[PDB]
């Protein structure tokens, strides 16, 4: 995360972190249930073998709330395309259930119609993760969060150098130095409605980070709710 603030205690409990065989977090995720983690399909390519870590806020001290979980099943979108990043969604079924505690709780999955008309029309959403802090900087040891404004579809389609498929939406700033970044992908994009946070996106990609004239691109989760729904019953 570029800019934004540090996730304080119990603030971003749905954040999950994909770690490689060498214990380095390479992508993020969103706790959906005791057994399911929602992430980006393009992430299932960033490591030979990987696991899921929840409850982590500082990759430099074993606080105690953490928990590493093994993935039993990884459900990638059949139509995922690596060239365009279209259909960038995936579900991970963990071998053992997640025990909800402080800094470990799931994010709510909204209903499509309500979400797009009432949730995605809100001023902002929240993006978090341990990704880089600067477009050219090392990854973060602290879990960060960023309030990212919803960007008009047209102004976004215009601002992007590549195609903004119907499975993508934009959030971020045009000039302001705040945006998600590498390492944050797969991570959660939620929207708060009356003290309750709903999953509304998946950190997908962007041209660099916090670039002027560019935004952050997220998977339109509302477009895959029946899919996520299905993947969670298999």
């Amino acid at each position: 995360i570029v800019g934004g603030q540090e996730c304080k205690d119990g603030e971003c409990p749905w954040q999950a972190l994909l770690i490689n065989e060498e214990n380095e977090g390479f992508c993020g995720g969103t706790i959906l249930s005791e057994f399911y983690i929602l992430t980006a399909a393009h992430c299932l390519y960033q490591a030979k073998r990987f696991k899921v870590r929840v409850g982590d806020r500082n990759t430099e001290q074993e606080e105690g709330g953490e928990a590493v979980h093994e993935v039993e099943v990884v459900i990638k979108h059949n139509r995922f395309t690596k060239e365009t990043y279209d259909f960038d969604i995936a579900v991970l079924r963990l071998k053992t259930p997640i025990t909800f505690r402080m800094n470990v709780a799931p994010a709510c999955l909204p209903e499509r119609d309500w979400a797009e008309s009432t949730l995605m029309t809100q001023k902002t959403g929240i993006v978090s993760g341990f990704g880089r802090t600067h477009e050219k900087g090392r990854q973060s040891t602290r879990l960060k969060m960023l309030e990212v404004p919803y960007v008009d579809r047209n102004s976004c389609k215009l601002s992007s150098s590549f195609i903004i498929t119907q499975n993508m939406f934009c959030a971020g700033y045009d000039t302001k130095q705040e945006d998600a970044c590498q390492g944050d992908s797969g991570g959660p994009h939620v929207t708060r409605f009356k003290d309750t946070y709903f999953v509304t996106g998946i950190v997908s990609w962007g041209e660099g980070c916090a670039r002027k004239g560019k935004y952050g691109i997220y998977t339109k989760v509302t477009a895959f709710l029946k899919w996520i729904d299905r993947s969670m019953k298999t």
Binding site: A105, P110, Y197
Partner: protein, 52 residues
């Protein structure tokens, strides 16, 4: 009108059925007796920042 007017007074999901508002909640919540508020079914409901 309806769900367009302050989410129809629903805590979460709002649905307009037959020119009226019908409220609902995510999994882990149950519609309150007033038919609008959402009550957590157990500890650590979804979308709630952990207070303890």
């Amino acid at each position: 009108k309806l769900c367009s007017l302050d989410n129809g007074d629903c805590d979460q999901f709002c649905h307009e059925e037959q020119n009226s508002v019908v409220c609902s909640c995510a999994r882990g919540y149950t519609l309150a007796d007033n038919g609008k508020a959402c009550i957590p079914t157990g500890p650590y409901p979804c979308g709630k920042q952990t207070l303890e």
